[PDB]
Amino acid sequence: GTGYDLSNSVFSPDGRNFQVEYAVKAVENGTTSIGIKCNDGVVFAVEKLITSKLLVPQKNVKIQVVDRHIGCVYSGLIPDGRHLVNRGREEAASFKKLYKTPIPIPAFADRLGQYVQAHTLYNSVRPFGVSTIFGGVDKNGAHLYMLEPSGSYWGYKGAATGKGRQSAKAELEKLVDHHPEGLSAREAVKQAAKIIYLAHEDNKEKDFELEISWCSLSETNGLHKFVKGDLLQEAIDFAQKEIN
Amino acid sequence: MDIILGIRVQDSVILASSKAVTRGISVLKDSDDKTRQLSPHTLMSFAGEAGDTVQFAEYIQANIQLYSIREDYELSPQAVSSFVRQELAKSIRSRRPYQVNVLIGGYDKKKNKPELYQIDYLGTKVELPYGAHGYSGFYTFSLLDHHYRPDMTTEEGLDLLKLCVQELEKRMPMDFKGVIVKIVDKDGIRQVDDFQAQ
Amino acid sequence: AGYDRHITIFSPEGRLYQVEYAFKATNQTNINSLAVRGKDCTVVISQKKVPDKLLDPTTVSYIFCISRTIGMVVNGPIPDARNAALRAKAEAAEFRYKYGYDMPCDVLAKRMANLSQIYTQRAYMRPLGVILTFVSVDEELGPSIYKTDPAGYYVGYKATATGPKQQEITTNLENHFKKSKIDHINEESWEKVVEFAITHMIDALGTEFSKNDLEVGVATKDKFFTLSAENIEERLVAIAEQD
Amino acid sequence: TTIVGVKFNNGVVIAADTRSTQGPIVADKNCAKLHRISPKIWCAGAGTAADTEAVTQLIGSNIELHSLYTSREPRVVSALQMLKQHLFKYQGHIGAYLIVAGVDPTGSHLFSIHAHGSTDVGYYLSLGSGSLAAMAVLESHWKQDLTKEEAIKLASDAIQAGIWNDLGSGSNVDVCVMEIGKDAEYLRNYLTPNVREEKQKSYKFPRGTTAVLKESIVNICD
Amino acid sequence: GSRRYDSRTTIFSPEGRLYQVEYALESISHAGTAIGIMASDGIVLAAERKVTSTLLEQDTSTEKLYKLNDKIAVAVAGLTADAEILINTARIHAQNYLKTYNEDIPVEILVRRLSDIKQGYTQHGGLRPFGVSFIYAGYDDRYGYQLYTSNPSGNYTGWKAISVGANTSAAQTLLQMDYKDDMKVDDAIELALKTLSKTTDSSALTYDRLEFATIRKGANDGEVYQKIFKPQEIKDILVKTGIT
Amino acid sequence: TSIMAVTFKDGVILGADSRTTTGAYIANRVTDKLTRVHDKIWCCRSGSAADTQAIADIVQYHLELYTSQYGTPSTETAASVFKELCYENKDNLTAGIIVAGYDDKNKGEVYTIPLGGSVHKLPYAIAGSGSTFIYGYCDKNFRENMSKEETVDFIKHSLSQAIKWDGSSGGVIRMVVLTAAGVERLIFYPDEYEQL
Amino acid sequence: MTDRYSFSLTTFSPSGKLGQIDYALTAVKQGVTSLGIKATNGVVIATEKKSSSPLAMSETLSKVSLLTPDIGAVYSGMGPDYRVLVDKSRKVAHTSYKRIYGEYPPTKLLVSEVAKIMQEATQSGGVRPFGVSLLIAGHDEFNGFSLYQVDPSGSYFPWKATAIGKGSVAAKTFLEKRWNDELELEDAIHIALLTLKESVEGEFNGDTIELAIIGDENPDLLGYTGIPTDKGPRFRKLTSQEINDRLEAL
Amino acid sequence: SDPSSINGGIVVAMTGKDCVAIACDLRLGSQSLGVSNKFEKIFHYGHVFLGITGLATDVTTLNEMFRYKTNLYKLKEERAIEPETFTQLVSSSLYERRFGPYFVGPVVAGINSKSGKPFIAGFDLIGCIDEAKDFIVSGTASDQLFGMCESLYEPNLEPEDLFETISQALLNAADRDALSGWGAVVYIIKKDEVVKRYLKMRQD
Amino acid sequence: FRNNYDGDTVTFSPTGRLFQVEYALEAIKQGSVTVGLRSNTHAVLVALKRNADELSSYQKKIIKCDEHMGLSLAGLAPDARVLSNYLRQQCNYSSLVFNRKLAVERAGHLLCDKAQKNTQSYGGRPYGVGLLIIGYDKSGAHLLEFQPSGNVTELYGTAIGARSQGAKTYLERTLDTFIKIDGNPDELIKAGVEAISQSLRDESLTVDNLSIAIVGKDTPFTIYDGEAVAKYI
């Protein structure tokens, strides 16, 4: 019959979970955000629509840090995103407390993964309405990941989600082909600013604000930090130039 | 301790209980009735710890009366004493055990015979022709072992008690301020208001 | 009344649609896997299809190391796949701690199978849309293949296959055994058994593979490990010099 | 109590005396201190009688269930782990001291467990108040590679050392042999070196000697 | 959430009726007939075995008559499994009473408790009720021989003669037609068998399809006795009453 | 008990006597106080046999599960699980534990976890009732990055002295060598070390 | 999270039926045939091992399970439900009997425990009934040999002989004709093999058939000697070879 | 202080030829104060007998518990419980209270109705089973009883002889114990009949 | 359509919407208008109090949370009491435990997370009230806009409630002006009253109908009602 999409943990006759797929709709409807993995770290960037002049510039920070070496950005229901980061922070704290060592990015990924997957197992909960891009530097290098409402996640060279996910992916694939030797943290930052500017066309109606953060072994000492001031404006200029 | 005596004669059970209530250096009351009627033909006397005593007697009274209303029937004295022993036996291994000893005197209307049960705070129950809790037993058991007969009349029983009370007023250390005597028989429970000189 | 199709209760036919639909989800990944037993090793092969160029191929896998000796290959979506893997690892570590010896492959299978049986009887738990193939060289039973489905069913196999083209691979293997008359690959080295597996995978599916089209796991006495793109390449080159 | 364990070339054997006590009184002159956890896993227990028995049955029961669930022969290590973790959970309040031995798919095994939960492994072990008398014999005659017959003699001699020199020990010697390829053989009262001599007189009383007050029949039928 | 699949087993109908109770009774109506007849010197229990075969081991079988106490027994009509659940708690209840008061449990007290349990599944918990009806036959020194009946609702009443299960209407009419206050046990035994005989949906009323029990005070003693007839004992009594 | 762990040029070596007592009685004269919690992370146990066994058994379980999920654990991580167990349960434990492991990047590492539950990373550490007697000896004879042979000798000498003065120590001296080369078990007998 | 299915999934329909249980019964009907035959000196229970792939090793799976050394079980319906029911049954024989009286429970009582477990799955909140029917055969000192059937409802009955599953009707009719109160175990076994042959489509040999018996005590299967009172289990599963030998005298 | 010496009392059981005997005193006191001379310590469930020494309250409780359990056992098993089985029931019931035990010294006696074999068993307060072939003693005069039994006893005594022997053991043991005596009852048990006798003894 | 996906907050509509949250958001639109704006030295709230009858009182729209923080509400009054009371506890905890005044930005995050929890679990309902929060902390003056969806936003000014679009456009127009009104609370308030009046229709703001609050540099959050707001009408 029908009605296989009214309750969460339900399998449709073709083996799908519609509630999860509907969650994806909330994600695709969101702001575009990306992740670029450079040769010794990762760069995060996101689109901040300016609903009105009333929003204080530089004030509603989207990117979030977990512990001191991990960065998180997501598209969709912001509140759902914060909720997931809170779980990540507890998750990272519990790992460190027992094993002493700050949580390895791969282990962190599965921690978020099992949690998000858990929200597709019962009808008493709703799946997460966000796709999240996160990563950092650990004992064995840099790692970039993207997690879907289904709980699915994999490691990426470049990742994008949201409204302009297609432009971004197109651009990220270009970078990959033109840089088999790797991209540097400095370059990833500029390129990130560009990809966001380009992907902003699928929303060219409202004006936006750029936000970038990065975690690089050589640039930030493996710690997660926001790209501010001159390095930021410099990236904005590099984008504003190639947008024309 | 306080005096708690019970003696079962031919057709009734007689309970005598000291009237004194002493706290430390002062006797606070001299007319205290250490008894609760559990049902029209079942009377219970008690002695022990300052608060547990009444809390336990009343708790049981409430339960027996509740049983009476629900079943519109009066439990036999044997059944009541068993319920009481069970409650004390639970108590002994609880966090704060009831420190109460009791005598249960009842008239079994079905068997038409009086019954006397002695039960201590440990849940030790025994049926006897006569019993006592506390130090009284040390003077009254051999007394009654001498002057007691099964077929005695209620009047004979009261004289048997007078004999016990006198011995207690002569040899016991404390001034228990006399006793209150009650009789349980086929017609219920009544108090012998004239024993202060019977 | 028409809800006997949304949770795990019986339909008038005595069926459990949610369990059936779960089985359906197992093919979602469009990948086939197969396992065979050697003289004293066990091999599992699984297709690997990493389409997106933005992905890091090294982080994509449906094969798991549950314990020093147990390997698990999963046919089904990765999130349910990982939920199952984490559970099995937990079950494996606990068993060792409580009973003093390594959990046998068949015992872990029964335990995971029982767990699945529960999602089949309790309403608030949904079945996992995955089929689990566990392998090892048991200290008591030798090479072992045990597979469990969303119905809480499991059994031991001489060899087995799972995925969209399961039937093709199964009959192929069936035939080879009807021929050899033995219930295993009479080969001493695991490399040759891995080669046998990939060879018959190619025959049954009618397709050629590159080092990045497969995923391989091997179980030997006291150790289960996965092969690297290169280990595989070396394996592929070998089958090439026979055809 | 004197219990011992001794490994030989193809298995393990355990033994024990049969005395039970309450202070200076013998409670049981012939109790069995040898318990079966599974067909080929036996346990010699010392300490608080009821505790050794109860913990032995509990783990034995769980071993049977585990065996059925895994379709495998129980292993001595499993009994060892289940026992120790149980005893540890109880911070030594369960006064059990045991020697657990047996043969399983991995070979022959000899262990000991203390009330607090620590375990030991060895080729020869002894526990109980007769512990020292027994161990002195073992430390005096044990050698590597003993035959089933030699092992039984050594173990049995050790138990006797306790029976004769330890007031907490006495009566008979029980033994159980666990050989790698055969059924375990439990030898209850393998030795009975303390049979009471014939009494000097019979104290059978002439009927009517006891004064009776009253008599009656008892109803057993419902 | 779950609310979607909640049948709500404990609610009133617009007519102020309890659905599940009604439906449970509807289930009982198809169960083998059970009859209880009380005489001056005893009580009789007789039930018809629903579904039987050549291969059914009757000597070891019991699906309608259960001993609860030494002075109390019950006849069951409905789900046997559901009855066993209740039966076992009734057995415990009687022993608890005995342990507490050192006196056998008065028949009504046992019946009221069991009825209270049924009543509960009717007012709270969202669980289905027990699909069972009991005929209680017992003796105590306060009311002598007693006959009670309890059904899924948790209500109970006393009877001189009664039936539960199938064809109760026909059976009740036949009983209300030949019952006499001054009956003797043996009289009741015959009335019981005759009624079943006329209500039976089966060809003939043979011993292999019956369970029988009596509670008589065997004069040569002074105590009451429960007797759950054996296959042969029923085969005998059947020939005597004239049903061969 | 006399136990110690020493880092050297190629890794680390653990050593221990083999005596377990119940009063003045030697319940076991051939005890193995060197316990494995991971392929190349071992520990030396002292204090309560029951307590250290129960703790080691649990740490091993935690590291096994850790490995299943995130690969090989560092020596530091193992010392952390021990420490967590020892600190959190300090009121009911009597476990003096030394943690030693060999890592390819860090080479040899030693962490001592005394009674209170604190952790201390050192070049080498000594513990057990017998340790008190060799504080001066060990402080005067230890050198960093000694060779496998020099280290085995340092431990053999140190522990023979500990065994000599402490009645709670004795039997054979056991050692476990941890290097990139693998795991080597060593055993020395009274006739050999007593006359050093 | 948290199971919010605290209400019954099996309720009464207006007709008075309990659907979920009827449906469970239906699932049992679709299952492979299994049967039980009681003799004067033993009981036999058997079923067909319906291999679900020639690559699967049917020995790795047992439809006939030992519950206690004198009690065995077989079924028809959903194998996974049966499997967990076996684990619970072995455990309950311990937790509710052996640990109390130090002896295994008599056949009727264990059956009683199992039956209860099934009844609960018929009324407790959030669950469906078990989709299986069981045939339990055993022996105990004061009751001798017995054979029981337990349905998804929790109901159970004693039998002389019977069958459940796919071709139960035909099988039962056949057993009624051959059974008598004088059968010896070997006779029952023979009759069992004959009855099963009708219900088997393809191959019929010791590898596609599974059969066990509850007969004399097997001291040889004890695993130890020394205790006179311990004589060995009465339960014994026949070997493939043992089956083929009897198939030749079919 | 010692719960096992508050009330006093003793029990003893003996095996004979196709018979078993179990006896007890009738005293129930409180320290020095003798209170009741009718406190019997022997009970029975079907054909199985149980004597219990120790704290009176626990003696009564265990009796009520075993009646409760043996009654359900009969309902479910459809047969009376046997001595060997009952012994296990007693043992596990006691150990269930391992760390807050009943202060009693149980003694089981009876004839297995199927084997006809005579059976006696003793227990410590937390359940340790002592199954003797000759005799079992328990109570505040257990030392005296061990002395009497180890001396007076001999195997296969006829019911009439066993009665004399078990009575002499009990009587003389109780007379050396201030907390035992005050009357006594003896049970002679055979497959078909059970005789109860109240002995005449000192009353001091 | 919608009717099949709006029965609770644990259900997504086929387009990714959460109707129960949306219906909650509606309650705010039906509420009385309230404005919030700030300069670099002060933050102000202006609210229109609604009354039932002319015999009833005007329900309070402003709630003080701490000496440096407070808010105005639009929607279900009870839910505002619950949320403001929780904001008070968080302010309190920050002081007691850390001897630290809770930053407005943190209060916003805490509020967001609290609201969120009631949009992903069965049985709970979203909050049906909007909140404007003003405060003065170690980073100056602040204004936050809280929606029941859990979205909290920092702005220079804004307005919620019925006909709020009026005041909002006006503030979006006056921006460069009011944001510079430092050191003069009276001016900032008048800009607030001018903003709110841009959302009037029914009547005109009276003395027992207007509600104003302010917080700043050396000004503890203080509410003004009745006669106190007279000098502004």
Side-chain angles (χ1 to χ4, degrees), chain C residues 57-79:
Chain C
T58 61
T59 67
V60 177
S61 176
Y62 288 75
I63 293 190
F64 302 91
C65 299
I66 295 181
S67 74
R68 177 71 70 269
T69 59
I70 284 70
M72 178 184 84
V73 64
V74 183
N75 278 74
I78 190 70

Side-chain angles (χ1 to χ4, degrees), chain I residues 38-77:
Chain I
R38 74 166 187 85
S39 61
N40 294 294
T41 63
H42 298 69
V44 172
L45 289 171
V46 187
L48 176 65
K49 297 187 295 175
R50 188 183 287 167
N51 66 326
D53 282 61
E54 250 56 17
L55 278 59
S56 88
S57 58
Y58 287 69
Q59 185 153 291
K60 67 175 191 301
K61 298 264 288 190
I62 306 180
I63 309 178
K64 177 185 183 190
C65 294
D66 203 350
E67 297 303 307
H68 65 115
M69 202 190 279
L71 76 205
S72 62
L73 67 98
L76 301 188

Side-chain angles (χ1 to χ4, degrees), chain A residues 79-80 83 126, chain I residues 111-120 149-150:
Chain A
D80 280 21
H83 179 41
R126 151 174 82 69
Chain I
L111 277 182
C112 160
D113 298 335
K114 203 188 192 310
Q116 195 281 160
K117 292 166 183 167
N118 295 298
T119 74
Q120 197 175 188
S149 63

Side-chain angles (χ1 to χ4, degrees), chain F residues 35-166:
Chain F
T35 302
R36 203 219 83 153
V37 299
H38 200 72
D39 297 303
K40 287 185 176 175
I41 293 91
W42 290 54
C43 69
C44 304
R45 298 177 297 109
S46 75
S48 164
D51 291 350
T52 62
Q53 272 177 37
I55 289 176
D57 289 0
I58 290 189
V59 177
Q60 170 164 47
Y61 154 81
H62 276 300
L63 296 186
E64 169 159 334
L65 186 70
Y66 178 99
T67 299
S68 300
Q69 303 180 70
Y70 334 107
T72 311
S74 69
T75 300
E76 196 192 24
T77 284
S80 177
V81 173
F82 268 104
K83 174 261 168 41
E84 210 62 13
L85 287 166
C86 292
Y87 177 81
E88 236 41 272
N89 294 289
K90 59 165 65 186
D91 294 335
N92 299 290
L93 294 171
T94 310
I97 292 170
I98 307 281
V99 181
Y102 170 82
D103 167 55
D104 236 75
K105 186 277 182 62
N106 297 297
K107 180 197 298 182
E109 291 194 328
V110 169
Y111 298 79
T112 192
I113 302 168
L115 259 36
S118 61
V119 222
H120 305 274
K121 182 173 181 304
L122 307 157
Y124 79 96
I126 51 169
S129 57
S131 69
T132 66
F133 306 121
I134 54 174
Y135 265 82
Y137 183 84
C138 293
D139 185 59
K140 299 289 286 192
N141 291 76
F142 171 78
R143 282 175 287 125
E144 269 172 346
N145 291 113
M146 291 168 68
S147 60
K148 175 190 175 189
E149 327 133 294
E150 302 181 306
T151 297
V152 164
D153 281 342
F154 168 63
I155 289 175
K156 185 159 61 180
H157 280 74
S158 294
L159 294 185
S160 75
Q161 275 299 129
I163 285 176
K164 174 166 185 169
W165 302 114
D166 179 36

Side-chain angles (χ1 to χ4, degrees), chain C residues 34 43-49 57 60-61 63 190-199 201-202 208-218 225-241:
Chain C
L34 82 78
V43 173
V44 282
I45 273 64
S46 169
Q47 289 184 294
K48 180 170 181 177
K49 303 181 182 177
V60 177
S61 176
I63 293 190
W190 58 263
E191 293 89 343
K192 282 309 180 66
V193 173
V194 172
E195 286 165 7
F196 169 102
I198 299 177
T199 289
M201 165 99 291
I202 295 173
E208 214 67 3
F209 297 114
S210 86
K211 66 187 174 175
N212 302 308
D213 296 336
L214 300 184
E215 186 150 62
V216 186
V218 184
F225 55 97
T226 65
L227 299 182
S228 64
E230 295 319 302
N231 296 176
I232 305 222
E233 175 59 20
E234 161 184 349
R235 217 77 284 124
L236 252 34
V237 168
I239 56 90
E241 301 166 356

Side-chain angles (χ1 to χ4, degrees), chain I:
Chain I
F1 176 61
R2 198 181 61 169
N3 186 67
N4 272 163
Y5 305 94
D6 69 4
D8 48 67
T9 333
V10 92
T11 307
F12 267 116
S13 85
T15 63
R17 306 167 65 178
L18 298 183
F19 288 115
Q20 269 302 298
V21 175
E22 285 182 38
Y23 295 166
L25 256 43
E26 188 63 20
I28 292 80
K29 266 94 74 64
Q30 180 182 170
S32 174
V33 68
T34 184
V35 174
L37 73 175
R38 74 166 187 85
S39 61
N40 294 294
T41 63
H42 298 69
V44 172
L45 289 171
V46 187
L48 176 65
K49 297 187 295 175
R50 188 183 287 167
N51 66 326
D53 282 61
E54 250 56 17
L55 278 59
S56 88
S57 58
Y58 287 69
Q59 185 153 291
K60 67 175 191 301
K61 298 264 288 190
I62 306 180
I63 309 178
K64 177 185 183 190
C65 294
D66 203 350
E67 297 303 307
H68 65 115
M69 202 190 279
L71 76 205
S72 62
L73 67 98
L76 301 188
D79 288 5
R81 175 171 168 56
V82 169
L83 293 181
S84 62
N85 224 266
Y86 166 86
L87 188 40
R88 286 167 163 172
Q89 294 168 328
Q90 292 307 302
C91 278
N92 212 209
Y93 179 87
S94 190
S95 304
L96 295 166
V97 171
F98 300 92
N99 196 186
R100 184 176 192 172
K101 294 179 184 179
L102 185 64
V104 181
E105 171 154 357
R106 184 121 184 298
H109 296 314
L110 291 173
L111 277 182
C112 160
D113 298 335
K114 203 188 192 310
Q116 195 281 160
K117 292 166 183 167
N118 295 298
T119 74
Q120 197 175 188
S121 308
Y122 182 51
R125 74 170 169 72
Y127 290 93
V129 69
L131 303 169
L132 298 192
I133 312 153
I134 60 171
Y136 195 84
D137 56 25
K138 267 205 180 181
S139 59
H142 301 279
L143 173 59
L144 259 43
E145 199 197 312
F146 167 83
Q147 288 306 315
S149 63
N151 288 309
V152 177
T153 313
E154 191 175 353
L155 313 144
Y156 285 113
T158 188
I160 53 173
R163 306 155 188 171
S164 64
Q165 189 53 281
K168 202 163 184 179
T169 292
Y170 165 77
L171 286 174
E172 198 166 1
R173 213 280 177 180
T174 307
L175 188 53
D176 300 355
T177 305
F178 71 72
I179 190 278
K180 295 165 66 175
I181 303 194
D182 313 310
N184 188 183
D186 293 296
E187 270 315 88
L188 224 193
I189 298 181
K190 280 182 174 63
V193 176
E194 191 159 70
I196 188 107
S197 46
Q198 233 63 182
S199 294
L200 292 177
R201 184 175 184 172
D202 184 66
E203 61 183 305
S204 185
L205 48 182
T206 76
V207 88
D208 40 51
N209 151 61
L210 180 66
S211 190
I212 295 169
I214 183 177
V215 72
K217 214 165 182 177
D218 287 335
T219 314
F221 181 98
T222 48
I223 307 306
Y224 296 123
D225 294 295
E227 350 57 61
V229 298
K231 70 270 290 182
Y232 296 93
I233 306 175

Side-chain angles (χ1 to χ4, degrees), chain D:
Chain D
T1 284
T2 300
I3 71 328
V4 301
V6 179
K7 298 252 275 193
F8 63 93
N9 60 25
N10 194 53
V12 58
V13 46
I14 60 178
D17 76 299
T18 67
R19 177 176 294 184
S20 183
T21 57
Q22 332 176 77
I25 290 70
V26 179
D28 191 345
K29 302 189 286 191
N30 200 190
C31 57
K33 307 183 185 181
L34 264 38
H35 317 289
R36 176 183 71 257
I37 291 177
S38 67
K40 298 167 182 189
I41 305 296
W42 290 62
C43 189
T48 300
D51 278 347
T52 62
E53 188 67 40
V55 92
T56 262
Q57 298 189 322
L58 173 67
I59 274 64
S61 168
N62 287 318
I63 280 304
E64 180 167 325
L65 296 181
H66 182 264
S67 184
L68 266 27
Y69 184 108
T70 63
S71 291
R72 287 183 168 56
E73 293 296 68
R75 302 189 185 191
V76 189
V77 285
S78 292
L80 190 69
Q81 210 81 327
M82 294 163 96
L83 288 165
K84 83 145 60 180
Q85 280 165 21
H86 184 79
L87 290 181
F88 187 79
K89 189 172 67 196
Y90 281 87
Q91 303 165 167
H93 296 305
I94 295 181
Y97 296 87
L98 330 159
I99 288 175
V100 58
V103 295
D104 54 60
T106 69
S108 70
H109 310 271
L110 183 55
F111 306 121
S112 77
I113 307 180
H114 287 245
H116 280 279
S118 64
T119 56
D120 293 295
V121 65
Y123 295 101
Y124 55 105
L125 304 173
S126 71
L127 292 179
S129 53
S131 185
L132 275 65
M135 181 51 70
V137 170
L138 297 177
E139 284 293 28
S140 283
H141 306 303
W142 180 90
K143 58 166 184 170
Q144 211 140 192
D145 286 310
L146 293 159
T147 74
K148 168 181 180 173
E149 290 74 18
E150 295 182 304
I152 293 173
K153 225 285 177 174
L154 177 54
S156 181
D157 281 355
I159 295 303
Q160 289 202 69
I163 293 180
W164 304 127
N165 306 98
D166 171 37
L167 303 184
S169 297
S171 286
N172 311 125
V173 180
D174 283 0
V175 176
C176 184
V177 178
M178 287 151 273
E179 192 167 9
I180 282 175
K182 319 204 300 172
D183 280 356
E185 62 165 335
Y186 173 49
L187 306 173
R188 169 63 164 170
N189 283 8
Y190 175 58
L191 288 183
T192 58
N194 286 293
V195 177
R196 216 243 263 220
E197 62 173 65
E198 188 178 3
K199 286 229 264 287
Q200 217 50 45
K201 167 183 192 279
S202 164
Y203 297 87
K204 195 169 186 167
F205 293 94
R207 310 190 187 183
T209 302
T210 303
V212 174
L213 284 179
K214 163 169 53 182
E215 182 180 303
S216 70
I217 301 280
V218 181
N219 174 54
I220 296 293
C221 306
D222 55 84

